[PDB]
Design a protein around this ligand. Structure first.
Ligand SMILES: CC(=O)N[C@H]1[C@@H](OP(=O)(O)OP(=O)(O)OC[C@H]2O[C@@H](n3ccc(=O)[nH]c3=O)[C@H](O)[C@@H]2O)O[C@H](CO)[C@H](O)[C@@H]1O
Ligand SMILES: CC(=O)N[C@H]1[C@@H](OP(=O)(O)OP(=O)(O)OC[C@H]2O[C@@H](n3ccc(=O)[nH]c3=O)[C@H](O)[C@@H]2O)O[C@H](CO)[C@H](O)[C@@H]1O
Ligand SMILES: *[C@@H]1O[C@H](CO)[C@@H](O[C@@H]2O[C@H](CO)[C@@H](O)[C@H](O)[C@H]2NC(C)=O)[C@H](O)[C@H]1NC(C)=O
Ligand SMILES: *[C@@H]1O[C@H](CO)[C@@H](O[C@@H]2O[C@H](CO)[C@@H](O)[C@H](O)[C@H]2NC(C)=O)[C@H](O)[C@H]1NC(C)=O
Ligand SMILES: *[C@@H]1O[C@H](CO)[C@@H](O)[C@H](O)[C@H]1NC(C)=O
Ligand SMILES: *[C@@H]1O[C@H](CO)[C@@H](O)[C@H](O)[C@H]1NC(C)=O
Ligand SMILES: *[C@@H]1O[C@H](CO)[C@@H](O)[C@H](O)[C@H]1NC(C)=O
Ligand SMILES: *[C@@H]1O[C@H](CO)[C@@H](O)[C@H](O)[C@H]1NC(C)=O
Ligand SMILES: [Mn+2]
Ligand SMILES: [Mn+2]
Lengths: 468, 468
């Protein structure tokens, strides 16, 4: 979409391309390619590409691409605002005006700051026009010697023989929003003879501040532990026992889609029963919907708390930083502990094909002031998070079987993710077991995998992904 | 406080205040006052005030106000961006620069549009500086005759004897984000001799488009019906029977926190069991967390479908308009039908006391192209909505007993609300009944009401509310 074309005005000018800088720009032509096959080499990491288009019959793919384009166009039309338009500030204009940072509530009024005409003195008359589209102009006070035409209308003229009078009058100009919209903007025109300025007034409500009473840290007040279980009651009970060993009154919310659910009860345990096999992320979404505390801790039902599960440290990070989610480390019985720090980026692909997802191990930078903590895009499913941010992102209930990074991908950009290596939880090593493994370990060409590829293709407008 | 008072530069100028316009401005001094007592008058609506500060012991009120202020300051610090700063465009600068609309992904690069120096034809040397704080400048190509100092640094100088060369060079300037943040902005400085311009590059990811597959309108694919029941299985079953009379394969999600839950099942019914008395909005939040369709229809368990519950019309409105939620009408057995169209606004109050909520019956305007439909802030609990918007706003699981407008208040500004009068659902007219009434109908000085006032005081930074 960049042409870097020499316009005819400057086509006489020589330019030598910077090969290195032009490579940094988005060329909307991404693809996903695997590492070669064969035995791996010590300092090479094997990259695997998935073509998501292969999850569809050619007829399915064409229909899906069309519908996905239609739905995306619909989305853009509901999202995009005059505030997103490219405006260029004119040079050598006598018009002084607010460039950004001017906002009014729907159906409310403000004084518009910083309006003035820096014309030269000595003209016979000075005139300025204000034009709006979603509001109307008026003045907080009439300046003696200034003539106003259009008070309470979308177009306002100010005319004055005195320049100082005109400028004083502009300090008193008000904008009022006149029709109700939830979150939009009005691109105003401010003008004088032979000069024109566009600027934008944002028309929106202030955000819901969602403040939590705080009640060092009362963990029971700040934190709810959320989990999802299925046919693994032994693991679940060991988890609850281990939690209570360190945190006796912290509420544990358990979503459960077992066919024949056992009773789980005890002080500060909330058990939710779901239709059999409704699924994984559905149950995670259920569990988080019931959290009343500022923070939620995700734990799997196969976890065990130890003296290393110091939740206070995770709380500390979220209390002291702008992070929304902070992951801990999960230690296998083999002694290895993983923070599963992942980077996720989407790269622009060809128009209509969709974009490319890159997943790779790693993090962005260290978290200043917090040794052993980093900022990254995704973590292991042991994490403390602001409940509201987790619910704003959501665990898509369609992800019924096997999913992990799909949450961090849904939250990408929306969610400020960190990862601390020093808060550590252990991971634990009949009819029920064969059944559990049948749901948890399907074929890789199973309808589950295909469905998830089609879903990720559609939902996030991807064509392909690379895993590394 | 908008500053009205004349600066010493213009203190010599007379201004006559417009009493009418000054009254439109926010003076950060809102209060809540009841209508006069006594018998009401034909064209007057009785306004009643609730003082939320009276929900606290006066000792506790001071602690609450302090900690509420602290939490809000924390909130602001995590929300606010350099993009929200008031920038004033200087008059009479040769600097042309992008005013808004310039955006880059974290750790990505763009050509900066619209940079130029509009100067004299032929001068000695022309020099322009660019300064950034979260990124680095570089050029997509070196223009012959232009000298660059600081390529790949935060500060970049361009210098040229030729003005055309300099301007061509500016068409090739790139900004690269250099540190990772999810959603911020860099306020850059563009400068030349004796001239300075500030402008902001927004650094953020594109939004999650959350597109829904297609798998007239297939109601079963687009819509899930969501409800919450408690000890009223007769009503619930009559609802399900009535739904099936018109919509045989539409999924019904039922959240249930009854003590001894009855079995509810049938084709396309999903029953979720909650701990006894976990509550109302908790169960609404639960029900919505399980919806996999583009839209969710909220119905109470006491509803009955008729030929007038033509869901297709509600779907039509959300398919064809930027609305997020569209309410229908609920008809009492007495024959009266309510759309319960409400307006909600928050008005700024004194710093530290909090703001004032105004609730009044009414709507903003008619929904053009849809007779009998209006745009408003809240509706009766019969509505079709985009599932994702409903979950983004959420039903606060703290509201365990009696709540309605609290949802629309949480969604205020976030949620585009409409109301159609022609889609109509009926509202249906023992040990269990005494118990049901005990939970549904507490005293108005009961701990439930007091708790809700303290919650709304804290959560939304309100001091008081008026209901009309
Ligand atoms: C510590 C960590 O980062 N673990 C992740 C990983 O665990 P693992 O690969 O170790 O798998 P696991 O067997 O521990 O399963 C994790 C969770 O899946 C649940 N389950 C499984 C099958 C089913 O039909 N329904 C259901 O709810 C189960 O009850 C449990 O809480 O991979 C899973 C993929 O599914 C999840 O992303 C886990 O969070
Ligand atoms: C059509 C409409 O706008 N109705 C609203 C109104 O209904 P009503 O005044 O008709 O009251 P209702 O008794 O039907 O209550 C509505 C809902 O409350 C639920 N319930 C009640 C008590 C309890 O402890 N737990 C629980 O879940 C119950 O399952 C039912 O679906 O006022 C309610 C009480 O706040 C809700 O705002 C309703 O949506
Ligand atoms: C930590 O938080 C818990 C949960 O909010 C507090 O427990 C509640 O405290 C209130 C106020 O004293 C009591 O009315 C409730 O009965 C308690 N709820 C339950 C179910 O335990 C607890 O008091 C807090 N602890 C400290 C040290 O402040
Ligand atoms: C929309 O699409 C189709 C056709 O309208 C329907 O889905 C199928 O309906 C048959 C009829 O009972 C079932 O046997 C299939 O298993 C359905 N497939 C599904 C559930 O996708 C249905 O009317 C709508 N689809 C959905 C998603 O409910
Ligand atoms: C993308 O397309 C442009 C068009 O010429 C090309 O210059 C660029 O190198 C391409 N990149 C890839 C990844 O093929
Ligand atoms: C401003 O408005 C006046 C009054 O309509 C109009 O005649 C004029 O062309 C406009 N021009 C300026 C000064 O922007
Ligand atoms: C708010 O302040 C304005 C201006 O200072 C004053 O005229 C007005 O009456 C005040 N209103 C209330 C309710 O205090
Ligand atoms: C431009 O940058 C140089 C960097 O050394 C500095 O000397 C100068 O103050 C800047 N120019 C202006 C006028 O801001
Ligand atoms: Mn496991
Ligand atoms: Mn009712």
């Amino acid at each position: 979409l960049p042409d870097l074309a020499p316009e005819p005005r400057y086509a006489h000018i020589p330019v030598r391309i910077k090969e290195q800088v032009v490579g940094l720009l988005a060329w909307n032509n991404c693809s996903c390619e695997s590492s070669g096959g064969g035995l791996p080499l010590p300092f090479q990491k094997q990259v695997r590409a998935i073509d998501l288009t292969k999850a569809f019959d050619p007829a399915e793919l064409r229909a899906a691409s069309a519908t996905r384009e239609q739905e995306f166009q619909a989305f853009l039309s509901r999202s995009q605002s005059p505030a997103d338009q490219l405006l260029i500030a004119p040079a050598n204009s006598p018009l002084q005006y607010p460039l950004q940072g001017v906002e009014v509530q729907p159906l409310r009024s403000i004084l518009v700051p910083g309006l003035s005409l820096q014309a030269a003195s000595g003209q016979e008359v000075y005139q300025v026009n204000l034009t709006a589209s979603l509001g109307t102009w008026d003045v907080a006070g009439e300046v003696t010697g200034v003539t106003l035409t259009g008070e309470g209308q979308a177009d306002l003229t100010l005319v004055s023989p005195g320049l100082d009078q005109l400028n004083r009058q502009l300090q008193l100009v008000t904008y009022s929003s006149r029709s109700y919209q939830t979150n939009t903007a009005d691109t105003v025109r401010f003008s004088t003879e032979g000069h024109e300025a566009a600027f934008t007034i944002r028309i929106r409500h202030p955000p819901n501040p969602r403040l939590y009473p705080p009640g060092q840290y009362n963990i029971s007040a700040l934190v709810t532990i959320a989990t999802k279980t299925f046919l693994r009651y032994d693991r679940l009970r060991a988890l609850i026992t281990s939690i209570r060993r360190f945190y006796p009154t912290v509420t544990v919310v358990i979503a459960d889609d077992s066919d024949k659910p056992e009773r789980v009860s005890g002080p500060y345990v909330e058990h939710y029963l779901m239709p059999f096999g409704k699924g994984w992320f559905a149950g995670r979404n259920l569990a988080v919907s019931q959290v009343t505390t500022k923070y939620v801790l995700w734990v799997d039902d196969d976890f065990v708390f130890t003296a290393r599960t110091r939740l206070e440290r995770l709380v500390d990070v979220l209390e002291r930083t702008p992070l929304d989610l902070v992951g801990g480390a999960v230690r296998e019985i083999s002694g290895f502990a993983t923070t599963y720090r992942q980077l996720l980026s989407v790269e622009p692909g060809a128009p209509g094909l969709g974009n490319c997802l890159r997943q790779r191990r790693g993090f962005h930078h260290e978290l200043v002031g917090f040794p052993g903590c980093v900022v990254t895009d995704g973590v292991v499913n042991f994490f403390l998070a602001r409940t509201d941010k987790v619910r704003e992102v959501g665990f898509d209930p369609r992800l019924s079987r096997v999913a992990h990074l799909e949450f961090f991908l849904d939250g990408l950009g929306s969610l400020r993710v960190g990862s601390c290596s020093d808060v550590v939880v252990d991971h634990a090593s009949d009819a029920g077991a064969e059944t559990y493994a049948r749901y948890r370990y399907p074929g890789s060409l199973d309808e589950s995998q295909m469905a998830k590829h089609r879903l990720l293709f559609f939902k996030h407008r991807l064509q392909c992904m690379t895993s590394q």
